[PDB]
Amino acid sequence: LNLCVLTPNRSIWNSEVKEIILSTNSGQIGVLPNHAPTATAVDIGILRIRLNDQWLTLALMGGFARIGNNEITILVNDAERGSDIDPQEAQQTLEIAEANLRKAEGKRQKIEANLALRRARTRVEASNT
Amino acid sequence: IISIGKKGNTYFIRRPEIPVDRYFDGTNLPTAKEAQAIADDVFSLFVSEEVD
Amino acid sequence: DFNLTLPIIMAEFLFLMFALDKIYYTP
Amino acid sequence: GQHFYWQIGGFQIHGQVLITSWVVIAILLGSAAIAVRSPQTIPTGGQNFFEYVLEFIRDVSKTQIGEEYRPWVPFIGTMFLFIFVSNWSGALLPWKIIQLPHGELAAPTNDINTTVALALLTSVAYFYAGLTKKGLGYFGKYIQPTPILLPINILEDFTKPLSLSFRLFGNILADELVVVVLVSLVPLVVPIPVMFLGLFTSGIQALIFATLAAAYIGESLE
Amino acid sequence: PLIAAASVIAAGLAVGLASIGPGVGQGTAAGQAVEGIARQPEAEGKIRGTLLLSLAFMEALTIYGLVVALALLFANPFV
Amino acid sequence: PLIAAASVIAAGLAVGLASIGPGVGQGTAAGQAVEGIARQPEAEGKIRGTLLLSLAFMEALTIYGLVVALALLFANPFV
Amino acid sequence: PLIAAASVIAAGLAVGLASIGPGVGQGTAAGQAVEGIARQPEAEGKIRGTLLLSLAFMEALTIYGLVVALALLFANPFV
Amino acid sequence: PLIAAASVIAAGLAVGLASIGPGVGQGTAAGQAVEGIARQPEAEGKIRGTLLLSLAFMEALTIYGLVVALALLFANPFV
Amino acid sequence: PLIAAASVIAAGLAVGLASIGPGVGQGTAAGQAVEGIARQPEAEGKIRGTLLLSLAFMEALTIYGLVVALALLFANPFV
Amino acid sequence: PLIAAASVIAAGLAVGLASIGPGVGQGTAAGQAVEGIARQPEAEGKIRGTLLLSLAFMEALTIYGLVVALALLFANPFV
Amino acid sequence: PLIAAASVIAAGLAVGLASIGPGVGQGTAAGQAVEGIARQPEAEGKIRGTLLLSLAFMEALTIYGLVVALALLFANPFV
Amino acid sequence: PLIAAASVIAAGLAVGLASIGPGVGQGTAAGQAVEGIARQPEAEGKIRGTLLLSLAFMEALTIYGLVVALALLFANPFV
Amino acid sequence: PLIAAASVIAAGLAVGLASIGPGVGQGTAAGQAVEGIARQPEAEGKIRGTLLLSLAFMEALTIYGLVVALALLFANPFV
Amino acid sequence: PLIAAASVIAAGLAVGLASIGPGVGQGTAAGQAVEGIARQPEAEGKIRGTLLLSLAFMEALTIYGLVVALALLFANPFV
Amino acid sequence: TNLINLSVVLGVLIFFGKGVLSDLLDNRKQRILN
């Protein structure tokens, strides 16, 4: 199955894979080869590609995914190799974002604080992974 | 004004009598993180129905 | 039971209404 | 028991409900004068309770009539305050240790006579509005929406104050008989939350009643 | 006594089924009304007055059935 | 007395089932009407008048059944 | 008297179930009609006339059942 | 009289259940029809004629049951 | 008379349940048909003829049940 | 004893069906109310007071039916 | 014995239908409440206390019906 | 024996309908609760304790009905 | 024998309706639980233990009803 | 013979309602389970074993009711 | 023993309502004062 992870600039991982499991807007769905058709949008969260050996998580920041027939066109809003993040730096930044969220008033600014709290939370989440 | 560019950040810095949302810094080879930053600023400021 | 006690209490309520109107809700 | 001390003065008249009425009106005017006796710009201690009360009164009056709030803010406040008065009166009233002649006396709204009284006041105020602001010849009685729309309105206008009295009388007598039968069955420890919920509904029914009355009032305005 | 017997059984069936149905519907009322009113957490008190009026409109039928039960039980003029 | 017995049981069944059904439906009325009216939080009072008219249209049937019960209970002209 | 007894019980069952069902359906009517009519908050009064016609079409059956109950109760020509 | 008794009880059950069901369905009719017709707020009057025809098609059965009730009550040719 | 009694009760049950069910289904018919026909606001009159044919196909069964009721009530050849 | 027998059976049917329906509806209340209130995890306590008021409005009918059962069981004034 | 017979049958019907309905509704409660509470997997224990309070509010009616059954079975003061 | 007969039939109807309804609702509970709890596959054990509390709240009514059945069967104090 | 007759019919109705409802609900349980658990194909065995606990919680009521049936059939202490 | 008569009618009602409910629920089971299991077309056989276990858990109650029917029909030890 | 039910709820409600409603009224007065 062809997992094509692609940010709108960088094709993050066009690595065709054996299995995968990630968090959609549906929240939790494993990817078994040749399930019947769907295209999806992801929540801002890690993406455990269970390609044949490695259950490989990758810090997706949301985006959409056309899951074609053995072809996962992952069009991510952002996407990190979850090992590539320094976990302590992602944790310091997530702490910074949480402090920014507690401090951040305003409708737009508070909502952005929540959105990046989710984003940095997924960053720290796959940074743990 | 959603402000990207540093000479333009200067143009609205020297030209300060209008609303400027946030000086997004310039980044040649535009980083997707930076575009996500300006985009999330705009997305909240548009979810906020203030500017329409 | 519907006696004339209903008209008596209607009188009681109407007098108390105008009185307490001008008494408290006026003042 | 479903009986009461009938005084006679030309008809048999249950003295218990009227005695409860005198008591409720008495406590009403007593607190009203203790509050409205000392006026203050920065509102006085406890006077702010009456102030926020009348604030909510004129607020809901603006909400349901709007401008002519103050034309009937006194009548609506009279209705809701006396109704919540009789409600909390039947709620908190230790009113049985002095057994009266043929029946005890705790709240007058337990007598549906009082419900008929207040609801007739509601319907008659609707008639005064629909004859004063609206046309005396063409009130809401004028079959406006269809030529076939005469008798449905003729039934509904009667059904308005009728069900208004019915709901309130049933709520009052319901909470009364509930606490009565509960103290009858078990001792004093059991019926406490039952009376707590009855008191929760007690002001609630008065509020909803004044709300629907001013709804009909904004209707007769409309 | 059979007329008084059937007046008694009458009041029983009346109060029982009359207090069965409308309070169940008032439960449905409370349910999806308060579900929505908490979803938009702003105007709860403004909703609450109409909600109370609606709950009273629900309970008035049970009040009427209990009234008929009391008229058949205590001051039974049919028997 | 059996005619008066059945007039009594008649009024019981009438008031009971008549106050069972329509108040339950008025609960459904209140439910999804107020759910929507709070979803769009703007025009609540303008909706409220038609809502009250609808609630009265619901309650009128229970009023009619209670009227038949009172006619059979108090001023029974059939027995 | 048994014919008058069954005319009485007849009018009871008639008015009771006739006022059970259609007012419940009129509640469903009011429900999702006013839900939509408040969702699009524009044309409420234009909707309201057809809504009233619909509510009258609902209530006419309860009117007919109450008419049969009054004909069996007051001017009973069967008994 | 027993034949007239059962003609009376017949007309009661007929009118009662006949006015129970179809008016409830006409309530469902009014409900989701007017819900949609207010969702698209354009063609309400064009929809309204077919809606009225549909409501009449609903009410005709209750009319037929009331007709049978009147034939058994007033001009009873079976008893 | 018992044969005429049961012919009367027969016609009652026939007309009652026959006018219960199909008019309720015709309400469901009217509902989602007019919901869609107003969603696409173009071809309402072209839809309306088939809609009327469908409503008549619904009402024909109630017509048949009322016919059986009239045959048992007026020109009862079984009793 | 038959009057006391039917008062007993009366209280049984009353309390049974009165505690059947409204608590089931209060279950539906709790269900979709708490479902939504946990979906938006912010204002749970502010929702909780109105939720408790709604649950009490549900339980009051069962309280009323139990009250009628206690009045028929203990202090039976009909028998 | 017939009074004791009907007290026994009374307690049977009471406990049976009282334990039929509200536990079924508590099942609906548990259903969509725990469905949502697992959808947002965060605040399960905070939800769980209100969930337990809700389940107790469901079960209290069955407790009341069982109480009436025990009062009619063991310490029967009506018979 | 007829009092003991009706105590026996009482316990039968009690246990039967009491074990009919609430276990069916507990099935609905288990259904959509475990459906959601498997959709979000994370917090299953944390959900499971509240799920067990909910299932016990469902089963307690059937326990109460079985208790009334055992009191009428074994230690029948009514007969 | 009539007491033994009704004990037999009691056990029949008990076991029949008790095995009607909860197994149907356990079917609904199995349905949407396994639907979701196969949608996310990862944690099936971890879900399966809670699923089995839920299925046992469903079946325990049918076990209780069968227990009452066996107590009335074999070791009938009421008759 | 009346004891044998009621044992026969007992077994009839038992087997009938016991085979009514749980097979209907097993139909609901099969429905949404196989709907999902075909939506994700991968792990059908792995789902199928748990599906069969679930279907057997559904059918076991009908097996138990049929067992009680056979014990009352063939080897009737109550009559 | 009838109103001995009502007395304790009266006491607790007077206490709690005193606290919260005085908070409300004094908040409104301090608002107007500011």
Numbering used by the authors:
A (entry chain e): 3 to 131
B (entry chain g): 157 to 208
C (entry chain J): 85 to 111
D (entry chain a): 23 to 244
E (entry chain N), F (entry chain O), G (entry chain P), H (entry chain Q), I (entry chain R), J (entry chain M), ...: 3 to 81
O (entry chain I): 29 to 62
Per the authors:
One sample without DTT or IBZ treatment was taken as the control sample. As prepared for the functional measurements, three different protein samples in detergent micelles were imaged: reduced (DTT), oxidized (IBZ), and control enzyme complexes. After iterative 3D classification procedures, the reconstructions of three different rotary states were categorized and determined in individual groups. Although the density maps generated from the control dataset could be categorized into three different rotary states, they were generated at relatively low resolutions (5.2–7.9 Å). One explanation could be that the control dataset was composed of multiple states, conferring a greater conformational variability in the population and thus flattening out the high-resolution details.
